[PDB]
Amino acid sequence: MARGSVSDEEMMELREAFAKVDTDGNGYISFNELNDLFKAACLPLPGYRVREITENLMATGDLDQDGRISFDEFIKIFHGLK
């Protein structure tokens, strides 16, 4: 797979933390892991912002693939840009 959004700096940091919480061995983390990863990665967005974006993401049909959250989703969520 090849895709990204966050700048090099973040991409490196965000990825670092994500992996630490991506022990699912599938490549994607879980809801709980996501939120924890956001705060663990020393991100700007608060705690509710993340939990909200997620619960609101699949709220329609974003995580309908299974319910998990791959690094890709996290990034697109951290930047919140098409």
UniProtKB/Swiss-Prot annotation:
Residue numbers carrying N6-acetyllysine: K76
List of residues that carry Phosphoserine: S5, S7, S30
Result for mutant: S5E: Promotes association with the actin cytoskeleton
Tissue: Detected in intestinal microvilli, hair cell stereocilia, and fibroblast filopodia, in spleen and other lymph node-containing organs. Expressed in peripheral blood T-lymphocytes, neutrophils, monocytes, B-lymphocytes, and myeloid cells.
Assembly and oligomerization: Monomer. Interacts with AIF1. Interacts with actin.
Modified residues (N-acetylalanine): A2
Source species: Homo sapiens
Protein origin, superkingdom: Eukaryota
Locations listed in the record: Cytoplasm, Cytoskeleton; Cell junction; Cell projection; Cell projection, Ruffle membrane
Binding annotation for Ca(2+) 1: D22, D24, N26, Y28, E33
Binding annotation for Ca(2+) 2: D62, D64, D66, R68, E73
Involvement in disease: Chromosomal aberrations involving LCP1 is a cause of B-cell non-Hodgkin lymphomas (B-cell NHL). Translocation t(3;13)(q27;q14), with BCL6.
Residue list for modification Phosphotyrosine: Y28
UniProt signal peptide: none
Section covered of the full-length record: 1 to 82 of 627
Domain EF-hand: 9-44, 49-82
Post-translational modification: Phosphorylated on a serine residue in response to costimulation through TCR/CD3 and CD2 or CD28. Serine phosphorylation promotes association with the actin cytoskeleton and targeting to peripheral cell projections.
Functional note: Actin-binding protein. Plays a role in the activation of T-cells in response to costimulation through TCR/CD3 and CD2 or CD28. Modulates the cell surface expression of IL2RA/CD25 and CD69.
The protein's name in its UniProt record: Plastin-2
